[PDB]
Amino acid sequence: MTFEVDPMDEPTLLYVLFEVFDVVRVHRPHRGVIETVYLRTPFSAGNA
Amino acid sequence: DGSIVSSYLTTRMPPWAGVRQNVMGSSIDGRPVLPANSTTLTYETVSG
Amino acid sequence: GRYVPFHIQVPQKFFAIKNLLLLPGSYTYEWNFRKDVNMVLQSSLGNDLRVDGASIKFDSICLYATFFPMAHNTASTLEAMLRNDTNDQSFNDYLSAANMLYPIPANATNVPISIPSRNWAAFRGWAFTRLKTKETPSLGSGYDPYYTYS
Numbered sequence: 001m002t003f004e005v006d007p008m009d010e011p012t013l014l015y016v017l018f019e020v021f022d023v024v025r026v027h028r029p030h031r032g033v034i035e036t037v038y039l040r041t042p043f044s045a046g047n048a
Numbered sequence: 049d050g051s052i053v054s055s056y057l058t059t060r061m062p063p064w065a066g067v068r069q070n071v072m073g074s075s076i077d078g079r080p081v082l083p084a085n086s087t088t089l090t091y092e093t094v095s096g
Numbered sequence: 097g098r099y100v101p102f103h104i105q106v107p108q109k110f111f112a113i114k115n116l117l118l119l120p121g122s123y124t125y126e127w128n129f130r131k132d133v134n135m136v137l138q139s140s141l142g143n144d145l146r147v148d149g150a151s152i153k154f155d156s157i158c159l160y161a162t163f164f165p166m167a168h169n170t171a172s173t174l175e176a177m178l179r180n181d182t183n184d185q186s187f188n189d190y191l192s193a194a195n196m197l198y199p200i201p202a203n204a205t206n207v208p209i210s211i212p213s214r215n216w217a218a219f220r221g222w223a224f225t226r227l228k229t230k231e232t233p234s235l236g237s238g239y240d241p242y243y244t245y246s
Contacts, residue, residue, distance in 0.1 A: 001208075001209050001210070001211075001222075002206065002207070002208045002209075003206075003207040003208075003209075003224070004205060004206055004207075005200065005204070005205065005207060005226060006205075007203040007204065007205055008202065008203065009202060009203060010202060010228060010229070010230065011069065011199065011200070011201060011202050011228075011229040011230070012200045012202075012226055012227065012228050012229055013061065013197050013198065013199060013200060013226070013227040013228065013229050013232055014058075014197065014198035014199070014200055014207055014209070014224070014226060014227070015195065015196075015197055015224065015225050015226070015227045016195075016196050016198070016209070016222060016223075016224045017191065017193035017194075017195060017222065017223040017224065018193055018194040018195075018196065018211075018219075018222065019192060019193045019219070019220035019221050019222065019223060020192055020193060020194050020218070020219070020220065021188065021192060021218050021220070022111075022188060022189035022191070022192040022193070023186065023187070023188045023189075024111070024112035024186065024187050024188075025184050025185075025186045026112065026116060026184055026185045026186070026187070027181060027184045028118075028119045028121075028178065028179055028184075029179055029181070030179070031119070031120055031121045032120075032121025032122050032123065033121065034123070036112060038112070040192075040194070041217060041218040041219075042214060042215055042216050042217060042218060042219050043194035043214075052205060052206050053201060053203065053204040053205060053206065054200075054201060054204050054206055054207065054208070055206065055208070056208075057208055057209070057210055058198045058199065058200075058207060058208060058209055059198075060196045060197060060198050060209070061197040061198060061199050062236075063197075063234065063235055063236030063237070064234055064236050064237040065234040065237040065239065065240040065241060065242060065243075066234075066237075066242065067234070068199075068229060068232070068234045068240075068242065069229055069230070069242050071230075071242055071244065072242075072244075073240075073241040073242035073243070073244055074144055074146040074147050074241065074244055075146065075241060076131065076132065076133075076146060076239070077146070077151075078146050078147045078148075078149065081241045081242070083242070084242065
């Protein structure tokens with residue numbers, strides 16, 4: 001991606017939302033147990 | 049000069065303190081903190 | 097007045113635990129709260145409230161939780177239905193976006209970025225906005241000493 005912006009006399013940032021499906025599924029199988037599985041697609045940040 | 053800024057690949061900003069700006073900062077009570085590129089941040093300073 | 101003893105009710109925003117319906121059990125619930133006056137406060141000029149003598153201090157803190165007084169045969173049936181793995185509660189973040197901040201220099205016109213090589217399955221789109229580097233904090237670190245803006 002390549003953005004052409006107006007010049008400013010100040011350091012500015014560039015905030016891009018790469019829109020994903022940031023989804024959590026929450027499993028509570030027994031009393032006092034929370035098991036959550038997170039998944040976002042495409043930009044998955046899980047090692048598993 | 050007349051060069052296009054920027055023509056090199058911009059790597060995204062690291063999400064921690066000391067990279068975003070090399071400005072002079074301030075402590076939680078207001079004491080002036082020297083910038084990140086200063087040579088006084090190669091060690092830590094503990095106040096009595 | 098300058099000197100304000102406050103009493104505030106701070107909502108929970110993290111989407112997986114924002115609308116979650118907890119089933120019975122004993123759950124620990126721990127959280128970190130900022131004391132940074134440039135983060136917890138907002139001024140109408142944007143001055144550095146650390147230098148300007150602003151100071152927040154947390155005396156005490158409490159967790160409140162309103163329970164629906166459901167019948168004990170109904171809330172035991174609902175507890176038993178919601179522990180099946182087919183009835184697992186599933187939430188999405190409303191933004192649902194990987195957020196990448198790219199530094200633009202002063203008086204810079206062209207900003208080239210790149211994503212190296214990736215499976216782009218279930219990609220939804222882009223939404224971009226230029227921000228100022230002064231007005232953005234370095235989140236991720238526990239304290240940003242260089243964020244002189246409120």
